[PDB]
Amino acid sequence: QGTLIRVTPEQPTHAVCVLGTLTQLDICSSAPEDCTSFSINASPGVVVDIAHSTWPLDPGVEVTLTMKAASGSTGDQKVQISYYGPKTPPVKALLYLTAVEISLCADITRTGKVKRTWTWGPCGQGAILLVNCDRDNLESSAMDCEDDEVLDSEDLQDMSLMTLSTKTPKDFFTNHTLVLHVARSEMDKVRVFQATKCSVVLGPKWPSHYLMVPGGKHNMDFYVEALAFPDTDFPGLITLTISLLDTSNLELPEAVVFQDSVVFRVAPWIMTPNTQPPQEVYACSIFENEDFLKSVTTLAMKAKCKLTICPEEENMDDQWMQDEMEIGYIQAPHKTLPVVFDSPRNRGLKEFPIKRVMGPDFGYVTRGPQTGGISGLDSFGNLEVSPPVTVRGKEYPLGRILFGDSCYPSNDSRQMHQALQDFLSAQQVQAPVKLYSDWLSVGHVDEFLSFVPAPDRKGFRLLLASPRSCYKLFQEQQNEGHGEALLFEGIKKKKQQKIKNILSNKTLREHNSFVERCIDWNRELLKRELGLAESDIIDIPQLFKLKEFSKAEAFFPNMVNMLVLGKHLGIPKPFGPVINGRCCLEEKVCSLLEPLGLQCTFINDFFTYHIRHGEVHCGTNVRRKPFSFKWWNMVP
Amino acid sequence: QGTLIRVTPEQPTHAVCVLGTLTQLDICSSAPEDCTSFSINASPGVVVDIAHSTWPLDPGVEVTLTMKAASGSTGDQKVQISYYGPKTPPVKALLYLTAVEISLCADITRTGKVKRTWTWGPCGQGAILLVNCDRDNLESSAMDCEDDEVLDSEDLQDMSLMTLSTKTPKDFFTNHTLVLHVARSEMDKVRVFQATKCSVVLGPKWPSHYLMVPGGKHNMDFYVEALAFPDTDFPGLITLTISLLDTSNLELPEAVVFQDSVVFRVAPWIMTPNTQPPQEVYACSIFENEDFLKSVTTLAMKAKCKLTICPEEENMDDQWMQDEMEIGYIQAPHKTLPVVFDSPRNRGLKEFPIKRVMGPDFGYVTRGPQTGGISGLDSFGNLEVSPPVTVRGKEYPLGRILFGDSCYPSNDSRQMHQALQDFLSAQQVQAPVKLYSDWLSVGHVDEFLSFVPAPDRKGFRLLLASPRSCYKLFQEQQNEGHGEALLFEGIKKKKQQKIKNILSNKTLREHNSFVERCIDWNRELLKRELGLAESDIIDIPQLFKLKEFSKAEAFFPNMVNMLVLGKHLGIPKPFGPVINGRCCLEEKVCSLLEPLGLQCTFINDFFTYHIRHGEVHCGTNVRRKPFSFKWWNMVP
Ligand SMILES: [Ca+2]
Ligand SMILES: [Ca+2]
Ligand SMILES: [Ca+2]
Ligand SMILES: [Ca+2]
Ligand SMILES: [Ca+2]
Ligand SMILES: [Ca+2]
Ligand SMILES: [Ca+2]
Ligand SMILES: [Ca+2]
Ligand SMILES: [Ca+2]
Ligand SMILES: [Ca+2]
């Protein structure tokens, strides 16, 4: 700030001056009469400036004091103002100053070291703070930040450092006291520890704390954790303030002399798209799925990934590893860690995120009502993210979250729960886009899109399911002699059908025109909101049929619902018509993908997953590498 | 948006094209073989564009259709694509188009007439919507917007107009349907009425509505009201959407064809500073205050103001008209109306805002817990606003709200309730500033500041209470012979004191140094946050003393706590030392104010108000003229 010191010949004045502060002088209020002019003389550690030698005694004239260094003792710097006039002997007003240094410091340049406002972008400022939502404590099943103690030294690596740096005379804190505080509004969102061993000084219970500080040169280290992610009621800033109080008069209340602040922004939860290199894969084991599990095991091994499996005792028969969770991350200059977003779906895999995923350097977060009020659209096969894109100038360097919705709300429409929606939006940095998925029986955007790395263009392709393309392929085969070829060749317990009867079935053709249409609507929506061109998009041949409530399901295994482990795709096995020794569906897919350097492996998921209304993507999950681009450098 | 139509020689295609929309053509997907080139021919109402005569049949080549006018009948515009090759006779693919107009319209230019996003500023766009928080209904004591009916025609003037403008063939709605909707997230915040007489189509109960629209040319008028002010969980935007659905296939679900939206911003509650021309004044009548009431009556009459009084039967002895309410306004292009913010203080004047102020063209709003959890800092003598100012470039054309707080939170500090704080901030346009007032026993910023019109500089002065200035004045008088002069001259039942004993009382001098200090701290705070210079500020001579919990009270009537009715000030009567026939306090004040064209009237409030810990400003309230500057033209 800036202080105004009023000087009088009546008696001398005593004041404290914090370094970095503007101190000004009121010379005229009490300038004695007889008097027409003034002079200022000061000790060597005080710099004096005068705008608008000696000067006329006029109120518009400005006098500023600056101190070069901290005082060694109370009052060791002096200012002497000399008032004089025509026939008037000089009279002197004295000012005794004590200079001190109070610096509250944090990593405001976002460089992992330490020594106003929060601003976004690469030319911006303000420190970052992580929610302490992992469990480094190897004992209990609580997030570290739910209690008031630092129980491991490792826990500190998740915390942000703030240092208070003081330089005062040795007895300065006889008569002054420092208090560190946070607004009541924000105390339930942060916890601060003093390092001495660590002790809580601010938190949900305490909004202010008197600091114990010795005179002279001192440095005090604090460790800060956040306890809440940005959300609809929390923009994500936390301000911590230091105040210096004069406690000199034993009769009177303490008087504020100086305040300074640092502003932290809480790190958002961020997702990783399929174009980010994989690191660990998840699945269930259940009745008769060893074969599915080996193809996945193989593909992991090829993509250099840890693998992780959830045995059927923990599963409670729940095979949809995709739906109960989404693995994202949080990121600060000093620490990056994965964090699992746990869907309130809460079916058999309910405990997997709490017990098995959350842990040392693995964060946890959840939203929505846990015991009801849910829909299928809250399952995280309905939550995806695009690769980085730029839309008409505006960069989305972390992509844009995509999630499925209805086209308008009715008695029969579904939506992802508002709390989930509001959370995703409040993260800001992946500006969510609503797509139309409620036309699908299950209702997940993973049932009609996926993304894959590409060596050229923007670095990926969007893949969309396409009846159009499956009709064209089948028509071409009939034209070229193979109308007799059988869909579902390789499956007993199942009624095969020939290309000619598929092409001539008019109901099926109607149902797929309606689906082509729901999907074309998203096509354009994605084109507008991700700035895609047709050459970013590849159509996968895929038929659907309509069923209960005229909702869409896959007619054969939904190939777009694939596992993407870098260049190694785990695509559902369509069991197409076998022509010249190969399924023409597999051949068609391979011909669209292999020129992008992609390897397609067709995994059989038919009786295990497909007849249960999901495929390979729905049966699995992937942790992937965080973006290199730093979220705080975006300007959302 | 933008649609993509796929053409085939297989059979003809039928599509609807909304005017204002980009329609593109996929020529290559189903282009027959033999074929190398194409030509397009269309009817006269279709404009065809082709980037990247006849053309090579190559997917990168772009074809766009535009329609000039609405169709008179289904399929009355045609497009014919001709595929041909080296030795290949032309084959034709047909496209039959129906053009229609769907325009959802609102006052997006903010000009009171009608015929994307919401953007601030004078070069911005987006319609405004008022909260319907008055009571034009002369019957009940409910806000108009609490029910689902328009019970007066006058009520409609508070509402915003939206018009749906359609142009279609006569049978178009045989096979298509229009639905108007709002997100579930925002349905509890808006109500929409169809004009036919008015019937509710959207609201807290209903998020979508099938519209009944005739083919041909039609115009349908809707009336919209908001039900909630911007707040911490509501940024203040409301989006209303129209969707066109194809209902042609009786077997299949409806298919979205077109959506458009309008975005409304809800008008914020805005305060008026003392520098705005007054229009109506408020007070109580109680035991023995007729004399106070006549001086106010006089001053009103001089300032051309309605006057309004609350008799003691309604009062329940509560005299502090200032504290229970604050009169602001809301403002849209079509309608401006005052609105009372009712403090949850809830003392004797509890009913006055509900019954007596709220009414025809008088709005109502309230916040905070009504039956407890309050402090004195929630009384609206602790809520003020500055005049317009510009702070280091940034304009605050409506001023900045100011409210008192503690310097940091402790077991003994008070604050204005968070809900009140959060409301004020969410209004955005008067970016509140926190001042330090908790050092006062009552704790209101009106106890130490006020603002007054000035003919020069920035158009006002800030007035601050000043012990410094009262010591200087009293000292000057003692110096000039009048040390014997008696403070409280004119008051029996009261112990007079002489200037010499006042000047020499050291405790009193200490207490006032502590007060000088609390006030100097705000001085600088105001200087920084309102960009004020010393020449904007005038010090009023005022002494204090400390009492219970070392909290400050006024030693004589607090003159800064005045009623400002344009150039006519109602200043508390200090009862100063009478020197050369006049109170030197009155004379000093008059000498600082009269050169600004201000008329000072000193009203005696001593036994009525002052000994009850408040003055003239605390006993009264004022409605004032809304700013001329339009809030939506600010860029907060
Ligand atoms: Ca802990
Ligand atoms: Ca931790
Ligand atoms: Ca769960
Ligand atoms: Ca950790
Ligand atoms: Ca997912
Ligand atoms: Ca009504
Ligand atoms: Ca009304
Ligand atoms: Ca009230
Ligand atoms: Ca009205
Ligand atoms: Ca007020």
Side-chain angles (χ1 to χ4, degrees):
Chain A
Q1 191 162 321
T3 315
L4 184 51
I5 295 172
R6 278 151 178 180
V7 295
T8 63
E10 276 186 299
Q11 80 298 340
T13 303
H14 290 83
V16 176
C17 287
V18 178
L19 291 184
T21 278
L22 170 82
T23 313
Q24 262 178 312
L25 253 60
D26 172 24
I27 288 166
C28 303
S29 71
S30 320
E33 201 31 40
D34 298 340
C35 273
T36 207
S37 301
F38 75 97
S39 268
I40 289 179
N41 194 357
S43 70
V46 166
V47 194
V48 168
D49 295 331
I50 306 187
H52 302 99
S53 50
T54 75
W55 282 271
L57 201 157
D58 148 41
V61 80
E62 272 183 17
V63 201
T64 295
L65 296 179
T66 313
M67 323 266 275
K68 299 187 186 213
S71 288
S73 74
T74 306
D76 57 18
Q77 286 300 310
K78 328 173 76 220
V79 178
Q80 180 190 261
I81 298 90
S82 279
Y83 304 105
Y84 65 95
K87 295 200 144 207
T88 310
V91 317
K92 303 183 166 185
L94 305 185
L95 176 54
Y96 292 89
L97 300 169
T98 311
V100 302
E101 187 187 327
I102 329 288
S103 302
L104 193 57
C105 289
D107 187 13
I108 68 189
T109 63
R110 312 139 173 184
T111 66
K113 72 146 205 308
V114 161
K115 292 154 180 221
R116 298 286 166 270
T117 53
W118 202 97
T119 57
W120 291 86
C123 299
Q125 248 195 341
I128 314 300
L129 182 51
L130 299 177
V131 189
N132 193 352
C133 55
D134 72 358
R135 179 173 65 211
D136 277 310
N137 181 311
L138 302 139
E139 197 142 302
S140 86
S141 45
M143 287 180 279
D144 294 337
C145 68
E146 281 168 357
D147 63 3
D148 296 330
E149 301 200 62
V150 178
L151 296 164
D152 300 8
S153 63
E154 287 92 12
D155 198 19
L156 295 192
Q157 299 171 24
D158 301 332
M159 304 206 193
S160 298
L161 181 67
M162 178 172 70
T163 68
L164 175 63
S165 203
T166 52
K167 201 178 183 172
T168 69
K170 285 149 186 202
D171 69 313
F172 182 73
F173 296 100
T174 282
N175 294 310
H176 294 80
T177 174
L178 288 166
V179 42
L180 182 80
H181 46 107
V182 60
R184 278 189 179 107
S185 185
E186 291 166 9
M187 79 188 161
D188 63 322
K189 292 168 190 102
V190 65
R191 188 173 295 101
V192 183
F193 293 100
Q194 202 180 172
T196 318
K197 299 183 183 192
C198 273
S199 200
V200 62
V201 295
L202 300 178
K205 280 142 186 183
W206 307 280
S208 54
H209 193 72
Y210 283 104
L211 297 177
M212 303 293 144
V213 186
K217 258 212 169 163
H218 188 77
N219 270 302
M220 187 175 303
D221 280 350
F222 304 85
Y223 284 93
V224 191
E225 50 171 22
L227 324 186
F229 281 91
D231 218 316
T232 42
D233 59 359
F234 180 40
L237 302 184
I238 283 159
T239 296
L240 298 180
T241 305
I242 189 78
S243 292
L244 178 67
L245 311 171
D246 188 340
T247 48
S248 285
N249 288 124
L250 292 178
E251 65 291 358
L252 309 170
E254 65 203 19
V256 179
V257 175
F258 169 77
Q259 294 190 318
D260 199 12
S261 289
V262 309
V263 185
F264 291 94
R265 177 168 285 288
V266 177
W269 183 81
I270 306 176
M271 293 178 62
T272 55
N274 290 359
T275 55
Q276 280 295 114
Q279 289 168 331
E280 167 177 12
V281 186
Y282 302 79
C284 303
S285 51
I286 60 160
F287 294 100
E288 288 150 303
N289 91 309
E290 299 66 16
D291 305 335
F292 174 93
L293 292 184
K294 285 162 182 132
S295 314
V296 179
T297 300
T298 313
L299 200 64
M301 195 132 309
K302 304 223 208 133
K304 306 284 141 198
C305 274
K306 182 162 153 204
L307 173 71
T308 301
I309 292 166
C310 182
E312 75 156 14
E313 306 82 51
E314 296 169 48
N315 285 351
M316 320 302 294
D317 292 338
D318 191 336
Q319 72 207 95
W320 314 106
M321 182 55 66
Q322 177 64 200
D323 289 345
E324 194 76 28
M325 70 183 203
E326 184 76 46
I327 312 296
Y329 72 96
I330 64 182
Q331 175 184 62
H334 60 271
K335 170 63 75 180
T336 294
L337 65 98
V339 176
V340 180
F341 186 20
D342 177 5
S343 163
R345 182 177 168 258
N346 295 341
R347 279 162 183 240
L349 282 159
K350 174 160 194 179
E351 296 300 315
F352 188 69
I354 299 162
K355 291 181 179 172
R356 224 51 90 175
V357 195
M358 170 189 184
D361 286 3
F362 221 113
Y364 180 88
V365 64
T366 199
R367 287 297 182 280
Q370 297 291 310
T371 74
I374 275 150
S375 79
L377 273 64
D378 297 307
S379 301
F380 294 174
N382 194 36
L383 183 53
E384 304 296 308
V385 216
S386 78
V389 291
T390 307
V391 179
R392 305 203 237 166
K394 197 182 165 56
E395 260 205 274
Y396 291 94
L398 309 164
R400 291 250 252 165
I401 285 167
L402 311 164
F403 72 80
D405 202 344
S406 44
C407 274
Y408 68 86
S410 48
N411 292 294
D412 300 313
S413 72
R414 307 166 282 169
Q415 69 164 60
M416 161 180 291
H417 196 279
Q418 197 58 47
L420 298 215
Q421 302 196 36
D422 280 6
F423 178 75
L424 300 167
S425 277
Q427 304 320 293
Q428 304 187 248
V429 297
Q430 294 174 308
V433 173
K434 287 190 188 177
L435 302 186
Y436 176 36
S437 76
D438 201 27
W439 61 275
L440 288 147
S441 165
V442 168
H444 296 187
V445 307
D446 79 351
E447 307 174 88
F448 66 89
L449 70 90
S450 172
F451 284 98
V452 293
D456 67 325
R457 301 267 318 161
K458 295 168 182 174
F460 60 92
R461 300 282 188 286
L462 165 62
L463 305 193
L464 295 162
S466 173
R468 187 198 50 71
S469 168
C470 190
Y471 275 99
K472 180 176 199 222
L473 178 78
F474 282 16
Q475 185 60 57
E476 275 165 32
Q477 304 309 292
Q478 177 176 89
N479 286 350
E480 213 183 300
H482 301 82
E484 226 62 29
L486 289 156
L487 170 66
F488 314 120
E489 184 57 53
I491 306 151
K492 262 189 159 153
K493 323 159 231 289
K494 185 64 177 155
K495 295 135 199 163
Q496 278 133 346
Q497 333 182 211
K498 313 169 178 182
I499 290 183
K500 69 166 68 148
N501 301 326
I502 278 144
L503 291 161
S504 74
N505 167 344
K506 290 182 212 192
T507 295
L508 189 68
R509 190 178 291 272
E510 273 188 274
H511 285 191
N512 285 281
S513 289
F514 166 74
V515 173
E516 166 174 277
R517 207 150 169 199
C518 301
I519 301 163
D520 291 348
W521 180 266
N522 285 280
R523 189 205 200 78
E524 295 310 318
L525 207 169
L526 295 151
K527 272 162 66 174
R528 195 190 54 255
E529 301 290 349
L530 305 175
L532 301 183
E534 289 293 322
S535 44
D536 307 311
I537 309 185
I538 283 166
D539 290 295
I540 299 296
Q542 187 66 45
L543 296 179
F544 289 85
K545 64 199 161 164
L546 311 178
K547 295 294 222 149
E548 296 131 48
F549 324 99
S550 291
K551 300 297 207 202
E553 320 186 333
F555 189 68
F556 53 75
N558 192 357
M559 292 193 284
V560 78
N561 186 267
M562 54 176 78
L563 176 64
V564 184
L565 296 169
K567 270 58 168 62
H568 295 69
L569 308 190
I571 307 191
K573 199 184 183 57
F575 287 101
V578 175
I579 281 145
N580 190 35
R582 203 144 65 106
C583 168
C584 55
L585 288 168
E586 299 195 1
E587 183 143 60
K588 185 53 177 328
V589 162
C590 292
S591 86
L592 301 153
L593 302 183
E594 279 162 358
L596 299 166
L598 294 150
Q599 329 261 298
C600 309
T601 296
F602 298 85
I603 309 169
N604 165 14
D605 77 349
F606 197 94
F607 287 94
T608 33
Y609 296 83
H610 171 79
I611 64 163
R612 308 282 187 75
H613 309 318
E615 319 297 338
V616 168
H617 190 264
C618 313
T620 57
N621 224 318
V622 188
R623 165 164 68 81
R624 309 187 144 85
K625 192 195 161 144
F627 290 101
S628 312
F629 184 99
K630 306 290 188 248
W631 65 261
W632 59 80
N633 285 327
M634 179 173 171
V635 185
Chain B
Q1 191 162 321
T3 315
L4 184 51
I5 295 172
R6 278 151 178 180
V7 295
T8 63
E10 276 186 299
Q11 80 298 340
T13 303
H14 290 83
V16 176
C17 287
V18 178
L19 291 184
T21 278
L22 170 82
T23 313
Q24 262 178 312
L25 253 60
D26 172 24
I27 288 166
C28 303
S29 71
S30 320
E33 201 31 40
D34 298 340
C35 273
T36 207
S37 301
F38 75 97
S39 268
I40 289 179
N41 194 357
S43 70
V46 166
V47 194
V48 168
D49 295 331
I50 306 187
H52 302 99
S53 50
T54 75
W55 282 271
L57 201 157
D58 148 41
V61 80
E62 272 183 17
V63 201
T64 295
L65 296 179
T66 313
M67 323 266 275
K68 299 187 186 213
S71 288
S73 74
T74 306
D76 57 18
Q77 286 300 310
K78 328 173 76 220
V79 178
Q80 180 190 261
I81 298 90
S82 279
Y83 304 105
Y84 65 95
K87 295 200 144 207
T88 310
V91 317
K92 303 183 166 185
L94 305 185
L95 176 54
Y96 292 89
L97 300 169
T98 311
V100 302
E101 187 187 327
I102 329 288
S103 302
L104 193 57
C105 289
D107 187 13
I108 68 189
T109 63
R110 312 139 173 184
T111 66
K113 72 146 205 308
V114 161
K115 292 154 180 221
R116 298 286 166 270
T117 53
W118 202 97
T119 57
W120 291 86
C123 299
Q125 248 195 341
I128 314 300
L129 182 51
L130 299 177
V131 189
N132 193 352
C133 55
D134 72 358
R135 179 173 65 211
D136 277 310
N137 181 311
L138 302 139
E139 197 142 302
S140 86
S141 45
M143 287 180 279
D144 294 337
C145 68
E146 281 168 357
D147 63 3
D148 296 330
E149 301 200 62
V150 178
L151 296 164
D152 300 8
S153 63
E154 287 92 12
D155 198 19
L156 295 192
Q157 299 171 24
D158 301 332
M159 304 206 193
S160 298
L161 181 67
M162 178 172 70
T163 68
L164 175 63
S165 203
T166 52
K167 201 178 183 172
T168 69
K170 285 149 186 202
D171 69 313
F172 182 73
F173 296 100
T174 282
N175 294 310
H176 294 80
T177 174
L178 288 166
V179 42
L180 182 80
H181 46 107
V182 60
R184 278 189 179 107
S185 185
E186 291 166 9
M187 79 188 161
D188 63 322
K189 292 168 190 102
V190 65
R191 188 173 295 101
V192 183
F193 293 100
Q194 202 180 172
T196 318
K197 299 183 183 192
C198 273
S199 200
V200 62
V201 295
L202 300 178
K205 280 142 186 183
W206 307 280
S208 54
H209 193 72
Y210 283 104
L211 297 177
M212 303 293 144
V213 186
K217 258 212 169 163
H218 188 77
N219 270 302
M220 187 175 303
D221 280 350
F222 304 85
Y223 284 93
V224 191
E225 50 171 22
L227 324 186
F229 281 91
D231 218 316
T232 42
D233 59 359
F234 180 40
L237 302 184
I238 283 159
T239 296
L240 298 180
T241 305
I242 189 78
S243 292
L244 178 67
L245 311 171
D246 188 340
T247 48
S248 285
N249 288 125
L250 292 178
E251 65 291 358
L252 309 170
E254 65 203 19
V256 179
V257 175
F258 169 77
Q259 294 190 318
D260 199 12
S261 289
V262 309
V263 185
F264 291 94
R265 177 168 285 288
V266 177
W269 183 81
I270 306 176
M271 293 178 62
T272 55
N274 290 359
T275 55
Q276 280 295 114
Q279 289 168 331
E280 167 177 12
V281 186
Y282 302 79
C284 303
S285 51
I286 60 160
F287 294 100
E288 288 150 303
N289 91 309
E290 299 66 16
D291 305 335
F292 174 93
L293 292 184
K294 285 162 182 132
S295 314
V296 179
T297 300
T298 313
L299 200 64
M301 195 132 309
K302 304 223 208 133
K304 306 284 141 198
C305 274
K306 182 162 153 204
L307 173 71
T308 301
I309 292 166
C310 182
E312 75 156 14
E313 306 82 51
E314 296 169 48
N315 285 351
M316 320 302 294
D317 292 338
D318 191 336
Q319 72 207 95
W320 314 106
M321 182 55 66
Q322 177 64 200
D323 289 345
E324 194 76 28
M325 70 183 203
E326 184 76 46
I327 312 296
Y329 72 96
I330 64 182
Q331 175 184 62
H334 60 271
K335 170 63 75 180
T336 294
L337 65 98
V339 176
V340 180
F341 186 20
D342 177 5
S343 163
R345 182 177 168 258
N346 295 341
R347 279 162 183 240
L349 282 159
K350 174 160 194 179
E351 296 300 315
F352 188 69
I354 299 162
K355 291 181 179 172
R356 224 51 90 175
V357 195
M358 170 189 184
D361 286 3
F362 221 113
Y364 180 88
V365 64
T366 199
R367 287 297 182 280
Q370 297 291 310
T371 74
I374 275 150
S375 79
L377 273 64
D378 297 307
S379 301
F380 294 174
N382 194 36
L383 183 53
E384 304 296 308
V385 216
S386 78
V389 291
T390 307
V391 179
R392 305 203 237 166
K394 197 182 165 56
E395 260 205 274
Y396 291 94
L398 309 164
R400 291 250 252 165
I401 285 167
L402 311 164
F403 72 80
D405 202 344
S406 44
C407 274
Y408 68 86
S410 48
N411 292 294
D412 300 313
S413 72
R414 307 166 282 169
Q415 69 164 60
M416 161 180 291
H417 196 279
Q418 197 58 47
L420 298 215
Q421 302 196 36
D422 280 6
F423 178 75
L424 300 167
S425 277
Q427 304 320 293
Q428 304 187 248
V429 297
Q430 294 174 308
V433 173
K434 287 190 188 177
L435 302 186
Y436 176 36
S437 76
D438 201 27
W439 61 275
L440 288 147
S441 165
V442 168
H444 296 187
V445 307
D446 79 351
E447 307 174 88
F448 66 89
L449 70 90
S450 172
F451 284 98
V452 293
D456 67 325
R457 301 267 318 161
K458 295 168 182 174
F460 60 92
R461 300 282 188 286
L462 165 62
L463 305 193
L464 295 162
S466 173
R468 187 198 50 71
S469 168
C470 190
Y471 275 99
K472 180 176 199 222
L473 178 78
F474 282 16
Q475 185 60 57
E476 275 165 32
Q477 304 309 292
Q478 177 176 89
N479 286 350
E480 213 183 300
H482 301 82
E484 226 62 29
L486 289 156
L487 170 66
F488 314 120
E489 184 57 53
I491 306 151
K492 262 189 159 153
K493 323 159 231 289
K494 185 64 177 155
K495 295 135 199 163
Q496 278 133 346
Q497 333 182 211
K498 313 169 178 182
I499 290 183
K500 69 166 68 148
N501 301 326
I502 278 144
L503 291 161
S504 74
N505 167 344
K506 290 182 212 192
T507 295
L508 189 68
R509 190 178 291 272
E510 273 188 274
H511 285 191
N512 285 281
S513 289
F514 166 74
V515 173
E516 166 174 277
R517 207 150 169 199
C518 301
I519 301 163
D520 291 348
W521 180 266
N522 285 280
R523 189 205 200 78
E524 295 310 318
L525 207 169
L526 295 151
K527 272 162 66 174
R528 195 190 54 255
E529 301 290 349
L530 305 175
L532 301 183
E534 289 293 322
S535 44
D536 307 311
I537 309 185
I538 283 166
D539 290 295
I540 299 296
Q542 187 66 45
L543 296 179
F544 289 85
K545 64 199 161 164
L546 311 178
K547 295 294 222 149
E548 296 131 48
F549 324 99
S550 291
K551 300 297 207 202
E553 320 186 333
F555 189 68
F556 53 75
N558 192 357
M559 292 193 284
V560 78
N561 186 267
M562 54 176 78
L563 176 64
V564 184
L565 296 169
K567 270 58 168 62
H568 295 69
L569 308 190
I571 307 191
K573 199 184 183 57
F575 287 101
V578 175
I579 281 145
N580 190 35
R582 203 144 65 106
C583 168
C584 55
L585 288 168
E586 299 195 1
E587 183 143 60
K588 185 53 177 328
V589 162
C590 292
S591 86
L592 301 153
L593 302 183
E594 279 162 358
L596 299 166
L598 294 150
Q599 329 261 298
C600 309
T601 296
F602 298 85
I603 309 169
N604 165 14
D605 77 349
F606 197 94
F607 287 94
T608 33
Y609 296 83
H610 171 79
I611 64 163
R612 308 282 187 75
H613 309 318
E615 319 297 338
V616 168
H617 190 264
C618 313
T620 57
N621 224 318
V622 188
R623 165 164 68 81
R624 309 187 144 85
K625 192 195 161 144
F627 290 101
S628 312
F629 184 99
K630 306 290 188 248
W631 65 261
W632 59 80
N633 285 327
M634 179 173 171
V635 185

